[PDB]
């Protein structure tokens, strides 16, 4: 009872920490905000006109950081042990074996080292201090499970590889050609367009629409060519962003549609029921063979539980109603045969 609730809440802590959902996301948003504030203060520490106050406030914020992350670290260890897979010393050690748990461990000891060096003032530590500060991004890095973001990006980039390559190829050709032409037109009148490398820098800055203004064509012919090629190249340089964004949005729409068409509920219940059957399994030989058949049912329902995980297709219902067609054919055949039997 008491211990029961003890482990129940321990499990809830595990959920909020290692299984973000709902307000646990609010909790992790808060810790991300703290990490981001630490990073901003670390950056401001670079400025000499603010280095004194930046570092002064950064010392206290780093103290708060170490306290909160140590508390989260120990609570995470305990709650993870809750799950009966990381229970006990051996299970806690296994949880620590996680790459992100060890990463948290190292960043935490590093942070303590930062604080101690600050207290001391060691020049060697002082020099290392900024690199140590950089480690805090590791918190956000950890917040991404199994590199989800990365994978997602890669997926889309691979899905649209042909068109991304098309955009890159055409844009690169436009960049090279326009840069060369503007170089030729302005190699003499304009000093900033002295070397073709400078023209390439101008072309890259222009076509991306950054337009610093450090190099700008002056001769009217140069400005005309720059205008035309700038139109073409800005379009082609903006392409990849547009292609990737449209890919992301269409992917979301597909995910939504698949979610709506999710029919896995009933086969998943079949999997659960056959699991219960296999449990009930565990005439001696008849019982043993019945257990074997129940295990086979368990595996079959798992396969069904997996083929449901495969999203929906219209081709599926095309085959479904196609089965309807064969059905009606056979049906009418039988009907006519038996009615002929009647006539006889």
């Amino acid at each position: 009872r008491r211990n029961v609730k003890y482990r129940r809440v321990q499990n809830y802590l595990y959920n909020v920490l290692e299984r973000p959902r709902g307000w646990a996301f609010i909790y992790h948003a808060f810790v991300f905000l703290l990490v981001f504030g630490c990073l901003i203060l670390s950056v401001f520490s670079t400025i000499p006109e603010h280095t004194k106050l930046a570092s002064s406030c950064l010392l206290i914020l780093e103290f708060v950081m170490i306290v909160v992350f140590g508390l989260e670290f120990i609570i995470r260890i305990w709650s993870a042990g809750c799950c009966c897979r990381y229970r006990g010393w051996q299970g806690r050690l296994r949880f620590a074996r996680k790459p992100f748990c060890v990463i948290d461990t190292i960043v935490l000891i590093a942070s303590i080292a930062v604080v101690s060096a600050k207290t001391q003032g060691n020049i060697f530590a002082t020099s290392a201090l900024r690199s140590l500060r950089f480690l805090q991004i590791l918190r956000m890095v950890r917040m991404d499970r199994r590199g989800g973001t990365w994978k997602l990006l890669g997926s889309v980039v691979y899905a649209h590889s042909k068109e991304l390559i098309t955009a890159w190829y055409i844009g690169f050709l436009v960049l090279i050609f326009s840069s060369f032409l503007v170089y030729l037109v302005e190699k003499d009148a304009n000093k900033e367009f002295s070397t073709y490398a400078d023209a390439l820098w101008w072309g890259t800055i222009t076509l991306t629409t950054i337009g610093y203004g450090d190099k700008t064509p002056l001769t009217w012919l140069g400005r005309l060519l720059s205008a035309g090629f700038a139109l073409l190249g800005i379009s082609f340089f903006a392409l990849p962003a547009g292609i990737l964004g449209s890919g992301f949005a269409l992917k979301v729409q597909e995910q939504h549609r698949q979610k709506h068409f999710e029919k896995r509920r009933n086969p998943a219940a079949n999997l659960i029921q056959c699991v219960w059957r296999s449990y009930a399994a565990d005439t001696p030989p008849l019982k043993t063979v019945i257990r074997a058949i129940r295990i086979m049912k368990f595996h079959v329902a798992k396969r069904k539980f997996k083929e449901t995980l495969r999203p929906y297709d219209v081709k599926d219902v095309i085959e479904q109603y196609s089965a309807g067609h064969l059905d009606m054919l056979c049906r009418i055949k039988s009907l006519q045969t038996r009615v002929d039997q009647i006539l006889g």
């Binding site: 129940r8 499990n11 809830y12 959920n15 299984r19 959902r21 009966c84 896995r264 509920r265 009933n266 086969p267 998943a268 219940a269 079949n270 999997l271 659960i272 029921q273 056959c274 699991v275 219960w276 059957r277 296999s278 449990y279 009930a280 399994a281 565990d282 001696p284 030989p285 008849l286 043993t288 063979v289 257990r291 074997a292 058949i293 295990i295 086979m296 049912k297 368990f298 595996h299 079959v300 329902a301 798992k302 396969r303 539980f305």
Partner: protein
């Protein structure tokens, strides 16, 4: 394991009913229908494929012995069971209500007999404001 292999051979001879030494879809279907099941031909094909590992399409005695050798209680099986229970979870708090579980077992998937369902509900602690943990269930039914 002489008793175990003897029992396995007795079961395999009961199913085979002949000296072929392999299980075909038709023979397995007839044997299982002798108990009043009436499955499908696709059911037979899937069931036999689940057992065979050579692709010939027939369950020989060694394949049945290998299938029955592995214990039901396995880590991967436990994870599959836990995630299947989580599929029908509310908030993912590890607890499920008796009424919703009753409805799921009575409608979704293989509709079980009410006697068995009541037996399993009474097997564990169903009290506690109508909420029962399924982790405890998972522990008990994987004990073999």
């Amino acid at each position: 394991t002489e008793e175990q292999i003897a029992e396995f051979k007795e079961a395999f001879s009961l199913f085979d009913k002949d000296g072929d030494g392999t299980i075909t879809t038709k023979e397995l279907g007839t044997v299982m229908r002798s108990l009043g099941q009436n499955p499908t031909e696709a059911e037979l094909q899937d069931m036999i494929n689940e057992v065979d590992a050579d692709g010939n399409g027939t369950i020989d005695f060694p394949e049945f012995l290998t299938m029955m050798a592995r214990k039901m209680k396995d880590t991967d099986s436990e994870e599959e069971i836990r995630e299947a229970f989580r599929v029908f979870d509310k908030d993912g708090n590890g607890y499920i209500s008796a009424a919703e579980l009753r409805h799921v077992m009575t409608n979704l998937g293989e509709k079980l007999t009410d006697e068995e369902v009541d037996e399993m509900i009474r097997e564990a602690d169903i009290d506690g404001d109508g909420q029962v943990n399924y982790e405890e269930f998972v522990q008990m039914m994987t004990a073999k």
